[PDB]
Structure formats: structure tokens, C-alpha cells
């Protein structure tokens, strides 16, 4: 579970494990795929997707997911998590605002991202309905058995941990997690690399002038922009994405039927939608003479139909056609 710098972490820029990168309000189904720097899913070892492992300290905390909250302008709905990554059904929102509850603390993370949800169709809803026609939307999956893409996930760079740099009663005293690789020296001249167990520091004294580092590359990370490079190498760790964008047919929009009214080679149409509906036509002469107008306000319109025919498209309701001799 990677940890990075959340931008407006409740107060201001903290370093949250759930630091939000790559917000994708690019689908249609009320859904956003998000990456936390935290890797929830199974535990550290082997069990139960519905548990929760973020970083506390240098360490993980692979425990229950109890009170996740993604949210935006309104509280979102989770869809599924896998890896670093969560899918959640959100409404539109100027921002994105994520957070669980460990239990002692709220411990959330928030971010800017322009979000919208147009459904696919000539109706510009704000939200998916219960009914209407199905038609080919873009949307992310529920599932994990997924390989359609993979993002590079090589090592972490080092990280700071000044909990290490204690004092040896006059000298600044570094320690190690588990024998991990601590990269160490101070502004003064003393040990210059640091690949060690718990060292002391002969020369410097102040904690604030030393290299508290953790080369702990036993587990790779996501290659966040808010990661410091592991300077050594491009290690392996090519790793999939679960939530591929797929060609789901969203349960989708439908605009109320029109009121057809006859006139001489002319369609008066008293019209009354639910939401802004893009109407348009095609006078089937080799003179096309089409028309487009989003209609949200109910409006009686007109169409000079010709002899050979016109067609009529009340939103994603199917196209009509008309003989006006």
C-alpha cells in the first residue's frame, strides 16, 4: 500500500496512504475508477478482497474495510476494489473526496477533478434512470479477472523515517525495520552510504541533519507521480489493471414521446421533455437541411417537411420518419 502526498487532506497537504491519483470521470455510468496509493484487497498475505491494507508507519495495516467513503458533491457508491484501485458510482462533482475510517481517526483524502456523467444518448440527463432503452455506453467492470491493460509497477524509492534517528545518549542513533537497507550519512563527515543494521553516528549529533532513509524494496509500488524514484534501476513488476473500460450497454436514457400534430407539409410538434434532449432531423432531399437543438424547456417547434420525407429523432428514442405529401 503506497503512501503519497494528499493535496487537501482534511486540513491541508498531508501524506495519506489513500492519496488519490488518476481520477477518471471519463465513463458514462455514474462510475469513476480511482487509484488510491493504498492497496486494499486481500490482506498482507492471502485472504478476503473485502479487507483493508493501508500504510501506517513504515508498516501496513491489513484489516477490515469497515467504513470506506468515496464522495464528491454527494456521497458516492462503492462498486468494487482490487489492488490499489477502486471503482465507485459517483454523481458529478467539481472535486473527488475519498476516505475510510480506521476507527480512531477519520483519515481521509481529497482531490480536484472535473467530473460529469453524460449518459450515452441525445438526452443530457444528470443521472441514470430505472428504465429506458439500452445502448452502447462506456463503463468499467465489476470484476478483477482482468488483463486488458497493465501499468508499470516497479519498486519504491526510499522514504523518510525520522523515528529511526534516535539518540545514543550523545550521538544520533539510526535503527532498522527488520534488517532493511537504511541509506545514511549526515551533513558532517561520518558513514557515507548506509547499508547496515542499526548504526550510530560518530560525527553529527542533531537528528535534523541526517539521512533517515528506507530502501525497503521487498514489495514494488504503483509508479505515482508522488513517488520518489528508486534510483538504482527499473525493476520488474508489470501489473495489470482490473477496471478496464468495457462496452457495457448501460441501462440508459429515454425522453417522453412527442405530440405529433399535422399541418400542410409541416410538423407542428408540441414537445415536453424530462431533460435537455438533442433533437435533430434530416430532410431527405439531396438538400439535407438538418437541424440541431438541445431541448430542455418544453417547446412547440416546426419542421417544413418536403414531399419525399423527413426523419425525426426524439432523443435516443428511435428515429421516426414521415410522408408529407
Amino acid at each position, epitope marked *: 500500500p503506497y503512501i503519497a502526498d494528499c493535496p487537501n487532506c482534511g486540513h491541508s497537504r498531508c501524506d495519506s496512504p489513500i492519496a488519490i491519483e488518476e481520477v477518471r470521470g471519463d465513463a458514462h455510468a455514474g462510475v469513476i475508477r480511482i487509484q488510491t496509493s493504498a492497496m486494499f484487497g486481500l*490482506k*498482507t*498475505d*492471502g*485472504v478476503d478482497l473485502a479487507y483493508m*491494507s493501508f*500504510m*501506517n*508507519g*513504515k*508498516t*501496513q*495495516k*491489513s*484489516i*477490515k474495510i469497515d467504513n470506506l467513503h468515496v464522495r464528491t458533491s454527494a456521497p458516492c457508491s462503492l462498486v468494487s476494489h482490487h489492488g490499489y484501485y477502486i471503482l465507485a458510482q459517483c454523481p458529478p462533482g467539481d472535486t473527488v473526496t475519498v476516505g475510510f475510517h480506521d476507527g480512531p481517526n477519520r483519515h481521509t483524502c481529497t482531490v480536484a477533478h472535473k467530473v460529469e456523467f453524460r449518459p450515452v444518448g441525445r438526452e443530457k440527463y444528470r443521472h441514470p434512470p430505472e428504465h429506458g432503452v439500452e445502448l452502447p455506453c462506456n463503463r468499467y467492470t465489476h470484476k478483477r479477472a482482468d488483463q486488458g491493460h497493465y501499468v508499470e509497477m516497479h519498486q519504491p524509492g526510499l522514504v523518510a523515517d525520522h*523515528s*529511526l534517528l534516535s539518540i545514543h545518549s550523545a550521538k544520533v542513533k539510526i*535503527t*532498522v*525495520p*527488520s*534488517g*532493511a*537497507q*537504511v541509506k545514511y550519512y549526515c551533513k558532517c563527515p561520518d558513514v557515507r552510504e548506509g547499508i547496515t*543494521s*542499526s548504526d550510530h553516528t560518530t560525527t553529527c549529533t542533531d537528528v535534523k541533519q541526517c539521512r533517515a532513509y528506507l530502501i*525497503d524494496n*521487498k*514489495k514494488w509500488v504503483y509508479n505515482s507521480g508522488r513517488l520518489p524514484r528508486g534510483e538504482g534501476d527499473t525493476f520488474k513488476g508489470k501489473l495489470h489493471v482490473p477496471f478496464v473500460p468495457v462496452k457495457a450497454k448501460c441501462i440508459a436514457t429515454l425522453a417522453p414521446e412527442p405530440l405529433v400534430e399535422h399541418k400542410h407539409r409541416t410538423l407542428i410538434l408540441h414537445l415536453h421533455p424530462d431533460h435537455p434532449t438533442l433533437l435533430t432531423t434530416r430532410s431527405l432531399g439531396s438538400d439535407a437541411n438538418p437541424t440541431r437543438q438541445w431541448i430542455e424547456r418544453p417547446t412547440t417547434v416546426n419542421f417544413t417537411v418536403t414531399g419525399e420525407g423527413l426523419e425525426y429523432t426524439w432523443g435516443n428514442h428511435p428515429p421516426k420518419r414521415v410522408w408529407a405529401q
Partner: antibody
Amino acid sequence: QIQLVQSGREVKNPGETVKISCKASGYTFTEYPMLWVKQAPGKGFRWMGLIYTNTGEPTYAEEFKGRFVFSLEISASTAYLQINNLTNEDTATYFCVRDYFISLDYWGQGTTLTVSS
Amino acid sequence: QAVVTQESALTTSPGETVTLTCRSNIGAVTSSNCANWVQEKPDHFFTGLIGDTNNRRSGVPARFSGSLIGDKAALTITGAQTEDEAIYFCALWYNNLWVFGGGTKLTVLG
């Protein structure tokens, strides 16, 4: 059911190499990786690392990155510990162990090395 | 770079309830430390008891249960038996490696 039976105890003069085998029985090798633990005469128990018996990647504890090398005769359900350029203070007992159930569930019998000229 | 601490020795009598604890030097022990309890009987004989704080290995008597008490992992033997006289070690996970405690020598009347 699960038996991890280890090689017998060796004697080796400083500088030598040793390959300690751990032959696994009762489980499907591949879904459970191996922990190598050092219980040094006085000092108590210490994690030496873990090997992904599926991919084959080893993790070493920092104390063990270097002279220690984990490998596996996959094919025969064996994991092996190799300690090269034996130092005299490596006399101790090494256990293989199965990582499962959010911890370790089965331990082997131990292979004790006595580094001595 | 973390130090697990355990009681040194504990003495009980057959039939009693005894608790062993496992303390982490970095902070409270939590479920993401996946406390493990291992028993060492004489002859370099190791068996795992509990894993992931409270999962009892299969074929380990029910008198054994694990939990978190306060800020530490605990092992309770309910109805200790003479057979339980051994060394109990706790192990804690720290995001990338395992740290073992010093072990508790438990003595049971019998």
C-alpha cells in the same frame, strides 16, 4: 498430512558453502511459499526471508541479503537454503516453515550447522 | 527495525487460565500485524497455534485462542494442561518482514 522434513545436520569449516533441503509433503507446494527462520543457540527466533514458490522470487531479511540464497526444486517440492562463505557465527539451527493463515502454520524439524575447523 | 517483546517465563497449574502477551516497540499491535503464535516443545519441535491474530491452526486444541488486548497481541490458554509446558513465540508482520519475540517459557503443574 503436512510434513516438512529437512536435511540432517552438517559440520563445515569456515569459508565453505552448505545447501540445506526442505522436502514438503501434504500441500500443493505452489500455493504456499516458504519461510526460512534461524534460531540461533542463545538468541531466539529470527525471520531470514520468504520465497514465492509460485514465481520463484525470494525476499531476504536485510540481515541475510548476501551470503544467503533461497532456491527450490519445484518439481520435487523442495525449498533450499544455501549459505555461502560460511562464517563461524552461523552455527545455529535453520527451520523451513509454511506461510499460511496470516502467519506460519507448520514448522520443519530443523537442520543444525556447526561451522568448525 | 521493530522489537517484539514477550514475558520471559510464566508458571501456572493444570486447569488454570493463563495469558501471554506480545508487545511491539513501534506502537499498538493491530490486525495488520497478523500476530502469529508458535510453540516450541523439546527437540526443536515447532508447530503453529494461531495466525492472523485469531485463526487457530487446524488440530490445535481449543483451549488456545488469540486476540488483541489493549495495544498488544495475546494468547490465552483456557484450562492449561501439563502438555502445554513449552516455549511460545509471537511473530508480528511489519509491511515487508517478520519480527519474532524472544519467546515465553511456560511451566504447567503436572
